[PDB]
Design a protein around this ligand. Structure first.
Ligand SMILES: O=c1[nH]c(=O)n(CCCCN2CC=C(c3ccccc3)CC2)c2cccc(F)c12
Length: 350
């Protein structure tokens, strides 16, 4: 087998884990002995993103009441749900509309995972951890633990474990450093941008087969602008936990992968409520959703010209808002580059 460090091999295994993939599919409500995860077409996946949008011209301009439901079963025709039986959410509603635009986000990254594990390995004369790892086009060094740099990480995780969702508690198992090919280069533009940060990205595990081969991405050319709080960028927290709930770690799979990304923020569009932008106005390089908890400015490490806000959860002064923690959003893919991965046990509670 691979000379690959054992944390790496094992990490390959969990992100290329097909069973898992259906697990998540079922967690949306998918009917898999209707539509199986060989069939998941990027084809169908984007044809239904468009159906989510037409339902929001519709619902946001009053509309033919009956068509709203036609658009709804159109949707359901296209993505089989094991409903199974209750009564299905008929898409007159901004709420279940993004409920479903989250699902499709995941089927995207899941199709990238699933289609990925049918390229190269019928081998053998390279082996199975080995083939998956190369098709990541990424290099995954094991960060060495008792060293200062793993400790800054864990200090980050620590101080930014939130003030409210302190039930689970967190714990770090492996610190992977990461290089995807070429994204040093594409990021070069933003290399010297002002105002530049280490922030968090949690995702389900079943997504990181696709985050490693494509980086984080902006949403499809068809995905509702209205499906995302801040329209169609890429999303980051400073608080470890605002991101860490996004992996969807239960008691029956409490291991989570979180990213650390360097992100070229510049001048932040400050915003307390939602804002369905496509478009960032001139003079503005990022958005900042304003939270009532910031990490403590009294603590703000800056290594390599990037800031790192490993600061305990302090009240900002901002009560006026729909967000409890900050978020950051960028509208160009190159405006971020991935630095670390973390393997995390979500250690639940009593
Ligand atoms: O760490 C975080 N991770 C997240 O997942 N979200 C939720 C928002 C994600 C919105 N998406 C944008 C569209 C996606 C996509 C998927 C595949 C292909 C193209 C786009 C994926 C995800 C976050 C939201 C706020 C603060 C955060 F820290 C996160």
């Amino acid at each position: 087998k691979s000379k690959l460090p054992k944390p790496v091999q094992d990490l390959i295994k969990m992100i290329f884990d097909v069973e898992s993939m259906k697990k998540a599919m079922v967690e949306y409500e998918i009917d898999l002995q209707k539509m199986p995860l060989g069939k998941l077409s990027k084809r169908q996946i984007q044809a239904a993103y468009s159906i989510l949008s037409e339902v929001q011209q519709a619902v946001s301009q009053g509309s033919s009441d009956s068509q709203i439901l036609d658009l709804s079963n159109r949707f359901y025709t296209l993505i089989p749900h094991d409903f199974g039986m209750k009564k299905p959410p008929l898409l007159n509603n901004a709420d279940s509309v993004q409920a479903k635009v989250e699902m499709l986000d995941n089927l995207l990254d899941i199709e990238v995972a699933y289609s990925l594990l049918r390229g190269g390995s019928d081998d053998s004369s390279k082996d199975p951890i080995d083939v998956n790892y190369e098709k990541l086009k990424t290099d995954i060094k094991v960060v060495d633990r008792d060293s200062e740099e793993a400790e800054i990480i864990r200090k980050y995780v620590k101080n930014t474990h939130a003030t409210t969702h302190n039930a689970y508690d967190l714990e770090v198992i492996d610190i992977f450093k990461i290089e995807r090919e070429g994204e040093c280069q594409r990021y070069k533009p933003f290399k010297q941008l002002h105002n530049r940060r280490l922030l968090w990205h949690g995702s389900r595990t079943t997504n990181f087969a696709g985050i490693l081969s494509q980086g984080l991405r902006i949403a499809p050319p068809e995905a509702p602008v209205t499906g995302y709080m801040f329209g169609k960028g890429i999303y980051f927290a400073d608080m470890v936990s605002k991101s860490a709930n996004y992996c969807h770690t239960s008691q029956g799979d409490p291991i989570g992968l979180i990213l650390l990304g360097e992100v070229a923020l510049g001048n932040m569009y400050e915003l307390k409520h939602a804002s369905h932008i496509s478009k960032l106005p001139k003079g503005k390089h990022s958005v900042k959703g304003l939270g009532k908890t910031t990490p403590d400015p009294s603590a703000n490490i800056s290594l390599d010209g990037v800031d790192v806000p490993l600061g305990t959860g302090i009240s900002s002064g901002v009560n006026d808002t729909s967000l409890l923690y900050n978020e950051y959003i960028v509208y160009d893919i190159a405006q971020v580059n991935l630095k670390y991965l973390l393997k995390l046990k979500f250690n639940f509670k009593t």
